[PDB]
């Protein structure tokens, strides 16, 4: 149970919920065919569009509740340690990131982390105090994008619709950059199936721990767009 609530650009905190499309609470989306899978069930947004240089180190911050409603003492902040799973970021080119609707966009993946050497992306998130990072591709065309950030908690993912999707979107404007417009994109909903090997999955191993039995974890969705 967590909410995407801030972006940082090369270390500069952009502000609490600034440029963020956010849900009313920290409950997961569990229906991958719902429009909620795009940017969550959005109940607040603003007209701010964050400036993001191509090539910049982008941080996305997750907290158990909105801002002050989650404290440094909370064992489930940024998220409960049990909630093992991957963290991903997608972009979609839009006309105006502040005014665009979210249906029918063409999404491409720019970052993902799953399971490696016994450690999940969520473990990194906890180690880094609620922040997850990626480098904005250098070659991407400048301008308005929606940035979809996603954390999938898999501690109850062995059952249908048991995977817990924590999602939000940020409104961004990429500066500098190149001319790349990814030819292969995906739809939300559409990109995920409830039967995907990284969504319908029992992550508990031989000794009952969340180690996925040491097996490779297949992060849902497409290959990364790269420069
Ligand atoms: Cu939870």
Curated annotation (Swiss-Prot):
Biotechnology remark: Lignocellulose is the most abundant polymeric composite on Earth and is a recalcitrant but promising renewable substrate for industrial biotechnology applications. Together with cellobiose dehydrogenases (CDHs) an enzymatic system capable of oxidative cellulose cleavage is formed, which increases the efficiency of cellulases and put LPMOs at focus of biofuel research.
Regulation: Activity in inhibited by excessive amounts of H(2)O(2).
Entry cofactors: Cu(2+)
Entry's induction text: Expression is induced 85-fold during growth on Miscanthus.
EC number: 1.14.99.56
UniProt keyword annotations, A-Z: Carbohydrate metabolism, Cellulose degradation, Copper, Disulfide bond, Glycoprotein, Metal-binding, Monooxygenase, Oxidoreductase, Polysaccharide degradation, Secreted, Signal
Main localization category: secreted
GO cellular component entries: extracellular region
Glycosylation site positions: 173
Cofactor comment text: Binds 1 copper ion per subunit.
Compartments, as annotated in UniProt: Secreted
Binding site for O2: 155, 164
Disulphide-bonded residues: 39-169, 139-227
Biological processes, Gene Ontology terms: cellulose catabolic process
Catalytic activity: [(1->4)-beta-D-glucosyl]n+m + reduced acceptor + O2 = 4-dehydro-beta-D-glucosyl-[(1->4)-beta-D-glucosyl]n-1 + [(1->4)-beta-D-glucosyl]m + acceptor + H2O
Binding of Cu(2+), residues: 1, 83, 166
Biological function: Lytic polysaccharide monooxygenase (LPMO) that depolymerizes crystalline and amorphous polysaccharides via the oxidation of scissile alpha- or beta-(1-4)-glycosidic bonds, yielding C4 oxidation products. Catalysis by LPMOs requires the reduction of the active-site copper from Cu(II) to Cu(I) by a reducing agent and H(2)O(2) or O(2) as a cosubstrate. Degrades various hemicelluloses, in particular xyloglucan. Active on tamarind xyloglucan and konjac glucomannan. Acts on the glucose backbone of xyloglucan, accepting various substitutions (xylose, galactose) in almost allpositions.
Stated family: Belongs to the polysaccharide monooxygenase AA9 family.
Free-text note on domains in this protein's UniProt record: Has a modular structure: an endo-beta-1,4-glucanase catalytic module at the N-terminus, a linker rich in serines and threonines, and a C-terminal carbohydrate-binding module (CBM). The CBM domain is essential for binding to and subsequent oxidative degradation of polysaccharide substrate.
Protein name per UniProt: AA9 family lytic polysaccharide monooxygenase C
Organism: Neurospora crassa (strain ATCC 24698 / 74-OR23-1A / CBS 708.71 / DSM 1257 / FGSC 987)
Gene from which this protein is expressed: gh61-3
